[PDB]
Write an enzyme that holds these catalytic residues in place. Structure first.
Site, PDB file in Angstrom:
ATOM      1  N   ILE B  12       0.884  -1.339  -0.006  1.00 47.04           N
ATOM      2  CA  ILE B  12       0.121  -0.051  -0.121  1.00 47.04           C
ATOM      3  C   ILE B  12       0.943   1.156  -0.033  1.00 47.04           C
ATOM      4  O   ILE B  12       0.268   2.363  -0.162  1.00 47.04           O
ATOM      5  CB  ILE B  12      -1.133   0.135   1.224  1.00 47.04           C
ATOM      6  N   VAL B  19       9.068  -0.144   2.835  1.00 42.64           N
ATOM      7  CA  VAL B  19       7.782  -0.474   2.236  1.00 42.64           C
ATOM      8  C   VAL B  19       6.451  -0.783   3.331  1.00 42.64           C
ATOM      9  O   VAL B  19       6.716  -1.241   4.604  1.00 42.64           O
ATOM     10  CB  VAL B  19       7.866  -1.937   1.234  1.00 42.64           C
ATOM     11  N   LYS B  35       4.578  -1.289   8.492  1.00 44.48           N
ATOM     12  CA  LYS B  35       5.787  -0.525   7.879  1.00 44.48           C
ATOM     13  C   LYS B  35       7.215  -1.391   8.175  1.00 44.48           C
ATOM     14  O   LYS B  35       7.531  -1.608   9.001  1.00 44.48           O
ATOM     15  CB  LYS B  35       5.933   0.806   8.390  1.00 44.48           C
ATOM     16  N   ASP B 127       7.953  17.130   8.118  1.00 45.77           N
ATOM     17  CA  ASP B 127       7.585  16.834   6.609  1.00 45.77           C
ATOM     18  C   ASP B 127       6.048  16.726   6.434  1.00 45.77           C
ATOM     19  O   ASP B 127       5.414  15.552   5.978  1.00 45.77           O
ATOM     20  CB  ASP B 127       8.291  15.684   6.230  1.00 45.77           C
ATOM     21  N   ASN B 132       1.692  12.551   3.473  1.00 45.49           N
ATOM     22  CA  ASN B 132       1.802  11.993   4.840  1.00 45.49           C
ATOM     23  C   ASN B 132       0.496  12.317   6.021  1.00 45.49           C
ATOM     24  O   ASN B 132       0.773  12.152   7.126  1.00 45.49           O
ATOM     25  CB  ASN B 132       3.124  12.683   5.565  1.00 45.49           C
TER      26      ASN B 132
HETATM   27  C1  LIG Z   1       1.212   4.383   3.156  1.00 42.06           C
HETATM   28  O1  LIG Z   1       1.155   4.349   4.469  1.00 42.06           O
HETATM   29  C2  LIG Z   1       0.032   3.915   5.097  1.00 42.06           C
HETATM   30  C3  LIG Z   1      -1.142   3.431   4.771  1.00 42.06           C
HETATM   31  C4  LIG Z   1      -2.324   3.083   5.127  1.00 42.06           C
HETATM   32  N1  LIG Z   1      -2.517   3.248   6.628  1.00 42.06           N
HETATM   33  C5  LIG Z   1      -1.352   3.567   7.310  1.00 42.06           C
HETATM   34  N2  LIG Z   1      -1.105   3.520   8.859  1.00 42.06           N
HETATM   35  C6  LIG Z   1       0.160   4.013   9.071  1.00 42.06           C
HETATM   36  C7  LIG Z   1       0.820   4.085   7.628  1.00 42.06           C
HETATM   37  C8  LIG Z   1       2.130   4.827   7.795  1.00 42.06           C
HETATM   38  C9  LIG Z   1       3.027   4.699   6.574  1.00 42.06           C
HETATM   39  C10 LIG Z   1       4.428   5.468   6.881  1.00 42.06           C
HETATM   40  N3  LIG Z   1       4.819   5.989   8.116  1.00 42.06           N
HETATM   41  C11 LIG Z   1       3.811   6.009   9.082  1.00 42.06           C
HETATM   42  N4  LIG Z   1       4.192   6.547  10.449  1.00 42.06           N
HETATM   43  N5  LIG Z   1       2.683   5.415   9.087  1.00 42.06           N
HETATM   44  C12 LIG Z   1      -0.195   3.830   6.877  1.00 42.06           C
END
Ligand SMILES: COc1ccnc2[nH]cc(-c3ccnc(N)n3)c12
Ligand SMILES: [Mg+2]
Lengths: 262, 298
Positions: B12, B19, B35, B127, B132
């Site tokens: 995802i 990844v 993660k 960031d 994000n």
């Molecule tokens: C593409 O990333 C996500 C997609 C769906 N749900 C998610 N829940 C948490 C993540 C995420 C990704 C990267 N860093 C952090 N702290 N969190 C995330």
């Protein structure tokens, strides 16, 4: 200005007061260590001061490492030949957390004089992380000191550097300083520095901020005053040497007061 | 635990990190994001050390929830709550209609809550960009990816100069100030506010100087009257062109008076005068804020 975060300063101080209690090492842990002593720990912490000097690390990094070491030793028995490995891994982790440009792992292998391999340092890093459960954002004496410094009228570099010096001296000696919280050691260090340099005392505005008064600070202050008076004679000398530098305004060359008149 | 209880569903996300997989807990049914952080020749990455330590402390409805850390010899997995989409993808899906005002307003209010919470716990995000910022089907939006974050002291020291994705990066970073603070995250949220309204980046620069000039063309070239000390900053140049400040209603034309007022306070040049997340929560823009679900399927 914003660099002093006026909208969050009080929230942050309150949060650090909560966290320092949560991050506190166990006061009586050395008695439970079969192979290591307060003296061995003092030697280790003094070495870490020299390491911080060699690689020009933040003082904050040194304070964090000591926190990690004392917390690790609160639950893990360590043989004397492995204490420096714990210390090296702690300093590596502290550097990664706090430094813009941490030293390379190979630089941490080198400063142990090849007592340990890269493999050992990396495996210890992993172990320390597990034991501490990745909880590395610990409050330090310095995080309180820098807030307290904002209460000077006006700011005095000798006072600030001297307070840092005193806070750093307290890292060396688990007896007595394991029994005091960072915010309390910081308060005593700030009062003692202010008194030494300017003749002034713990201000009412800091009573307002911290709830601490000279009376509640007395025990730590009496300890810190004695440490300060005895500093030239202490077996470990790296902090005094460090604080002769112009970077810290040569404050280790200042004479301690003979009495505190509390 | 854990690990044997997770059934990976699909990839995802990706970063460097990094990844990210969608997975489900086979026993509880909980859907999570995994993660994965690859290990080794400098041991555990400082970005992972900072993300984990900080996220472990930060429990708030508008901050992505770190559920577990699976820490082994060669792999590090952070187990997070799953969210269905990021704000960037949502903005893209909302072409032709735009994002309804009540949703833009709900999202900004939530972003400010999440940010004020970080700042109150001495964390800079560093960031904040739509990629994000994660959204769920119930109308929540959450700050994610704390790999670039930092625990700060008071007053701040000098930290990494990078910092912040270029389009969202504050003028004090671009001009090389010795110190930067909580204001940098508010700048980024200002850019995101404008972007939710227009669905395009407010300042899409391609270099630091182009980024600066784009900001100057919109907000005026800052002088000592607007921003005391600006001319003395390391990367300030007396040769900078001196653009006039635009009518602020022309920056984001569909925005109402209260929206414009808030946006102008989030994009204040002087970091000392820029609005805090905490103060912004009480802005008249939010007098009628609600929390509706997204108007589109995620
Ligand atoms: C593409 O990333 C996500 C997609 C769906 N749900 C998610 N829940 C948490 C993540 C995420 C990704 C990267 N860093 C952090 N702290 N969190 C995330
Ligand atoms: Mg013993």
């Amino acid at each position: 200005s914003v660099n002093e975060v006026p909208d969050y300063h009080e929230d942050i101080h309150t949060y650090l007061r909560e966290m320092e209690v949560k991050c506190k090492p166990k006061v009586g842990y050395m008695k439970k260590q079969p192979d290591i002593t307060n003296s061995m720990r003092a030697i280790l912490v003094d070495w870490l001061v020299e390491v911080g000097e060699e690689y020009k690390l933040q003082n904050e990094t040194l304070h964090l490492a000591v926190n990690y070491i004392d917390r690790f030793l609160s639950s893990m028995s360590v043989l004397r030949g492995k204490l420096q490995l714990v210390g090296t891994a702690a300093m590596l982790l502290a550097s990664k957390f706090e430094e813009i440009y941490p030293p390379e792992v190979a630089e941490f292998v080198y400063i142990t004089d090849d007592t340990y391999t890269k493999k050992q340092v990396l495996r210890m890093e992993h172990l320390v992380l597990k034991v501490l459960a990745f909880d590395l954002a610990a409050p330090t004496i310095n995080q309180f000191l820098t807030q307290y410094f904002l209460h000077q009228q006006p700011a005095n570099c000798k006072v600030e550097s001297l307070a840092m010096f005193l806070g750093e001296l307290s890292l060396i000696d688990a007896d007595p300083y394991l029994k005091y919280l960072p915010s309390v050691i910081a308060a005593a260090a700030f009062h003692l520095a202010l008194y030494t340099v300017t003749g002034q005392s713990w201000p009412e505005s800091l009573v307002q901020k911290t709830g601490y008064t000279l009376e509640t600070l007395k025990p730590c202050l009496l300890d810190l005053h004695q440490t300060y008076l005895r500093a030239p004679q202490h077996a470990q000398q790296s902090i005094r040497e460090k604080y002769k530098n112009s970077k810290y305004h040569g404050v280790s060359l200042l004479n301690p007061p003979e009495t505190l008149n509390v | 635990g854990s690990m044997e209880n997770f059934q990976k569903v699909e990839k995802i996300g990706e970063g460097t990190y990094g990844v990210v997989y969608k997975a489900r807990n086979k026993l509880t049914g909980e859907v999570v994001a995994l993660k994965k952080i690859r290990l080794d020749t400098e041991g555990v990455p400082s970005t992972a050390i900072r993300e984990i330590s900080l996220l472990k402390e930060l429990n708030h409805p508008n901050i992505v929830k770190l559920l577990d850390v699976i820490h082994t010899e060669n792999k590090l997995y952070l187990v997070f709550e799953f969210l269905h989409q990021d704000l960037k993808k949502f903005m893209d899906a909302s072409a032709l209609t735009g994002i309804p005002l009540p949703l833009i307003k709900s999202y900004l209010f939530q972003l400010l809550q999440g940010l004020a919470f970080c700042h109150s716990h001495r964390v800079l995000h560093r960031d904040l960009k739509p990629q994000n910022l994660l959204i769920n089907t119930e109308g929540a939006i959450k700050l994610a990816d704390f790999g670039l974050a930092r625990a700060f002291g008071v007053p701040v020291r000098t930290y990494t100069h990078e910092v912040v994705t270029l389009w969202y990066r504050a003028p004090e970073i671009l001009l090389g100030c010795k110190y930067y603070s909580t204001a940098v995250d508010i700048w980024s949220l200002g850019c995101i506010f404008a972007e939710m309204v227009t669905r395009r980046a407010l300042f899409p620069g391609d270099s630091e100087i182009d980024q600066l000039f784009r900001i100057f063309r919109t907000l005026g070239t800052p002088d000592e009257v607007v921003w005391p000390g600006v001319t003395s900053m390391p990367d300030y140049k007396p040769s900078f062109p001196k653009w006039a400040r635009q009518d602020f209603s022309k920056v984001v034309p569909p925005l109402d008076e209260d929206g414009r007022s808030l946006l102008s306070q989030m994009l204040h040049y002087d970091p000392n005068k820029r609005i805090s997340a905490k103060a912004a929560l009480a802005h008249p823009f939010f007098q009628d804020v609600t929390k509706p679900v997204p108007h589109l399927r995620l």
